[PDB]
Design a protein around this ligand. Structure first.
Ligand code: GDP
Ligand code: MG
Length: 201
């Protein structure tokens, strides 16, 4: 009878930015993933547990290394939300963000979108906070991320659940089982970066 609250999420951005690494941190979603042969995609079911009940994000991760413009319409059709990703050690991935946005909005129009800057465990960072107080001003929320250490993993999913359910006080009551950190996210470096965003804001 009474079914599941489920949302289609489309994960997009340049080849090599860490999209498959980020979505694979949720272990039960990787083990139960579904290979949809004909659209070139892997659909991952990520269940999150809130104070108002359980929610599911059906994350569509492309299986190729496609280029801006080269994602069929079927990949985006009926999407309810999205995450756009770039790598902070490569400037060309961040310059392509606007074209990935243009592709989404043409097919889906006004849907809640989060912007993510990955690989902030690396010391030699090229794209900093002062240049990210830019683009995000499309009604787009920004978060610094590190996929291999699990740094800020829940933040993009918590922001999208608040918009789609309609409650700004919604919280997660327990965290999903996650793959153990494989790199070190220095604790004083993370604090320096957070201070930099507030300065930039
Ligand atoms: N150190 C580090 N490397 C990362 C991180 N995220 C991705 N990478 C590396 O980037 C390469 C490409 O990642 P992949 O997930 O295949 O990217 P995709 O093309 O967007 O699917 C891999 O060798 C990853 O291990 C991160 O958080 N930290
Ligand atoms: Mg991939």
């Amino acid at each position: 009878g009474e079914p599941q609250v489920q949302f289609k999420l489309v994960l997009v951005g340049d080849g090599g930015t860490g999209k498959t690494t980020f979505v694979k941190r949720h272990l039960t979603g990787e083990f139960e993933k579904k290979y949809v042969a004909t659209l070139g995609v892997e659909v991952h079911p990520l269940v999150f547990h809130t104070n108002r009940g359980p929610i599911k994000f059906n994350v569509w991760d492309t299986a190729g290394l496609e280029k801006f413009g080269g994602l069929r319409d079927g990949y985006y059709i009926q999407a309810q939300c999205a995450i756009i990703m770039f790598d902070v050690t490569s400037r060309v991935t961040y310059k392509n963000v606007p074209n990935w946005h243009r592709d989404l909005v043409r097919v889906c129009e006004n849907i809640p979108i989060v912007l993510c800057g990955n690989k902030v465990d690396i010391k030699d960072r090229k794209v900093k906070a002062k240049s990210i107080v830019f683009h995000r001003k499309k009604n787009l929320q920004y978060y610094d991320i590190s996929a291999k250490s699990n740094y800020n993993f829940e933040k993009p999913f918590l922001w999208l659940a608040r918009k789609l359910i309609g409650d700004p006080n919604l919280e997660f009551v327990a965290m999903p089982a996650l793959a153990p950190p494989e790199v070190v996210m220095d604790p004083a470096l993370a604090a320096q970066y957070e201070h930099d965003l507030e300065v930039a804001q």
